[PDB]
């Protein structure tokens, strides 16, 4: 048995189930959902995508709802989208390499191993604007439909915390841990022992790409006395220059929360957490 603390998700079991569903799905929804030729709905995308070198893939929810052995995967990708998708990023490459076993190919293997993979669940269960999101249901895969008003500039973020030792002609490298950087004050005791002699340079480091989009919510039902609202969200790299003013949109993401500082002076925060949304896909 393998499990995550405070969770009911298995890595290898989910991988095997995902591989089985991937190998076995042929317009099952046309049969089960309704009465409505082809074969192996999913497998064509994966067969074709390899030669074009793309690290992206889309995914529906009705297909999992239809296949016999994905109903439980439904609620597990629902409640824990990021964790389930991190599992899938490995399961997809596992299936990719287990499917190349039945093929002889020119030597393109230099890329797939170094590659990455990510998914985009787009057509998912409906959500009733933001009024439904009382704090019971935070941090979950969500959908919406609205238009665009305002777009912000690019927010860099510390991704590779370079560091410059003042002496001994030595650099230093350290990475981020859950969104903070702990500068090692020491100076590589072996060569030199100065407990707090190091510097910071920005040009060396690596940066992430983030945006913020003001959105107008356009629901299908409203209570007695409703009025328009505005929300903020966050998209990340490889999605920049995608959505802007003048486009109606149906979107997917993950409702979240965060506190804000009381000033630019000290660390005292608000008892109330400003809400936001982190994107997963845009239709």
């Amino acid at each position: 048995l393998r499990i995550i603390w405070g969770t009911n998700v298995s890595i290898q079991e989910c991988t095997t189930n995902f591989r089985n569903f991937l190998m076995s799905f042929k317009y099952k929804f046309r049969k089960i959902l309704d009465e409505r030729d082809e074969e192996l709905y999913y497998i064509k995308q994966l067969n074709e995508m390899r030669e074009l070198g793309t690290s992206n893939l889309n995914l529906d929810a009705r297909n999992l709802l239809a296949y016999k052995q994905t109903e439980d995967l439904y609620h597990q990708l629902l409640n824990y989208p990021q964790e389930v998708i991190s599992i899938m990023d490995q399961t997809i490459k596992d299936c990719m390499v287990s499917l190349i076993v039945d093929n002889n190919l020119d030597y393109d293997l230099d890329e797939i191993e170094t590659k990455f993979y990510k998914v985009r669940p787009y057509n998912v269960g409906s959500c009733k604007g933001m009024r439904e999101l009382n704090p019971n249901d935070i941090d979950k895969l969500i959908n919406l439909k609205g238009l665009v008003l305002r777009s912000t500039p690019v927010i860099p973020d510390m991704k590779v915390a370079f560091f410059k030792c003042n002496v001994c002609d030595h650099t230093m490298a350290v990475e981020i841990d859950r969104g903070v950087i702990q500068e090692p004050a020491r100076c590589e005791r072996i060569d030199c022992n100065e407990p707090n002699s190091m510097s910071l340079i920005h040009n060396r480091c690596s940066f992430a790409d983030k945006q913020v989009i003001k959105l107008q919510e356009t629901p299908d039902f409203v209570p007695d006395g409703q009025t328009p609202h505005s929300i903020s969200l966050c998209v990340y790299d490889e999605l920049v220059d995608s959505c802007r003013a003048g486009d109606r949109i149906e979107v997917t993401g993950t409702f979240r929360s965060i506190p804000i500082r009381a000033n630019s002076r000290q660390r005292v925060l608000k008892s109330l957490y400003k809400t936001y949304v982190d994107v997963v896909h845009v239709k």
Partner: protein, 654 residues
Amino acid sequence: MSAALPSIQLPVDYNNLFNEITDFLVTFKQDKGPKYMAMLQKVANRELNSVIIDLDDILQYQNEKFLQGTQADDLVSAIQQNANHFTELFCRAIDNNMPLPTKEIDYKDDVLDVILNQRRPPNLTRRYFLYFKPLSQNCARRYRISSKPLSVRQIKGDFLGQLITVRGIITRVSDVKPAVEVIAYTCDQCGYEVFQEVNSRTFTPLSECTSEECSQNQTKGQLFMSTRASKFSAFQECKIQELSQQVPVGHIPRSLNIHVNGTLVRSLSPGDIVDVTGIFLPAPYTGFKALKAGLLTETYLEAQFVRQHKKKFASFSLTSDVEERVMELITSGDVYNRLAKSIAPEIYGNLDVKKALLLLLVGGVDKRVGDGMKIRGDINVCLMGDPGVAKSQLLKAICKISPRGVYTTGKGSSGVGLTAAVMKDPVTDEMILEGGALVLADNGICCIDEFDKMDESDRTAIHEVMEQQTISISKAGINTTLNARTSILAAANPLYGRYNPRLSPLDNINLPAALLSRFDILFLMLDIPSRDDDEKLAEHVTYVHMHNKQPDLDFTPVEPSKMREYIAYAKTKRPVMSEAVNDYVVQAYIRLRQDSKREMDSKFSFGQATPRTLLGIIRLSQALAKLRLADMVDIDDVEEALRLVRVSKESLYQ
């Protein structure tokens, strides 16, 4: 130091308080099994998110103790005070004894119970909020109070924290948002959690490792926080403003603030009569650091239960008795004209106009094309006519009885008071919008007077509203297509006060037919003397002024509560129309069209019947079918519709 913090004692005895509370939690059987324990079983089933507290049941158990010769140990007399401390004692008592889950935990349920069982202060182990509700004095009178409806000004100061019930009107409430109650700090190295508790507005995070294992450790590996383990609960604030009739002479009312959390955040909406209940508690603010003498406190209140005399349309579910009310209402017969009669009996006659108001209230039937369009089941009426006759009693009664009602003047703040506004919210930085008089009305009713005196801006807005249920604005940050879904009911007077019998209505009236075409109905209420009718007109007026009791007919007009119950029940249906009535409607439409066009282009002629006239006839026939409570339309209704349509202007020929 006994000088500072010296000893003192009071009759309070938490030892027996807890015993009494816990015995009550389990002895309840007078109103499954012990329904309190049954609701606890439901909570174990994850059915509800907030326990309910009945207080007259506590009174009844005290009565039981009194009858059995036991020391009743009355705790309500103290619970009315200091409820902020008793909340955490009642929660502890409940947590002490929680029944076991009769059902099993699965992958399809709340995602919190799984963690609760995984790890199976005490606050984070609490899966149930609490929200009190005070007694209704009708039963406190039985056997023999503490909280009556009070005002924004009659606080008296000493009522900080006691049990109170304040009425008024809610002006603006911010959107619901989360607020922490317990922090979840996990250690990187020790692997053990930490519980940092915050109850003020702000705090300071715990960064350095004071973990219990780190205490016996040279190294102090840093800790961090969690986004799911840490507790949370909503927090939303509202403002009351005092009711009009209770304001003293020439006194300007003042405001007040309340705080809300968790479940009951959804039971508040601006513009409704309310009876808030809770406790009035202080907060840390002392003016602003120059006009201060120390110890000053800004204040607020606690929200625990909401009851409002105005029941919106969405609260309709039948029961064992309200259907009986409807049954005895419909048994009498003549229900339609009886309603038209009971609509504002303070004024005389005009049963046709009262009926038109009734059909305005009904609204019609909603239909969807499904091709990217729908159509309104909505009505729009006007009561053009000269002064002297009653004009405003109708609108005032409509606003009194109908919910989601609104009243406005003709001139004044019509520039933006009938339109969207821009404002920053107090409790959180945000550009929230609160609309004008129309927007505060939705799926409800609106009233207007002296329409001729309003601005062309108001005319343009109402022109768009009447036919289409949106609103368009291109002034500022607001670039919305706001949904109105409102029913308009205006009124005005001719250019010369009294009617001009030698001029047509199309010239005597000041409004243009380019807009009035949307007005599906229109009455011309003008007065000419007559020796006999004014006899009993004066009789009626003199009697009603002698005493408010309307004429003593063998008839009892009924309360607007029952009227709103009936209208809500009738709004549930969606009848259908047959071809036998459709063909007659088409024939009547052709008749009226040709007759009015060819003949009525003369003295007493107003424009011409229109497709909107046909649509209004259809909607009103649908309303008649709804009132009869049948899913089909009879031929016996279009006759009534057209009779009223052509009788609206009978007086124009005398």
